[PDB]
């Protein structure tokens, strides 16, 4: 596929559905990782984000090390445009969460 080994930059726009994307992770071994993309929603239309990325950066707050929660907070706080640095790892996202 298009899809790149190391982390990419992708630009989201907020919307009724919030940004289209929904996380497992922050625990242990685990960080935070996209477990959903919903259908139309902004992360579908960038066709960039991935089920298996783990997302390392939303708008300079590093997460990379961060709770589920930490992570949920700084998501709904990011603003109207949002710019995820996303790494593509679904064999790592299919050990936890298969």
Same mark, same amino acid.
Request: glycine share 12%; charged share 30%; hydrophobic share 30%.
């Given at each position: 596929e298009d899809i790149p080994r190391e982390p990419r930059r992708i630009v989201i726009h907020r919307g009724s559905t919030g940004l289209g994307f929904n996380i497992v992770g922050g625990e242990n071994g685990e960080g935070i990782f996209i477990s959903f993309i919903l259908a139309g929603g902004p992360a579908d239309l960038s066709?960039? +984000? @991935?089920?298996?990325?783990?997302? +390392? *950066?939303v708008n300079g707050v590093d +997460? @990379?090390?961060? *709770?589920h929660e930490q992570a949920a907070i700084a998501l709904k706080n990011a603003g109207q445009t949002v710019t995820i640095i996303a790494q593509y790892k679904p064999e790592e996202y299919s050990r936890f969460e298969a």
């Open positions: 066709g960039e +984000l @991935r089920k298996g990325d783990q997302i +390392l *950066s +997460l @990379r090390n961060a *709770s």
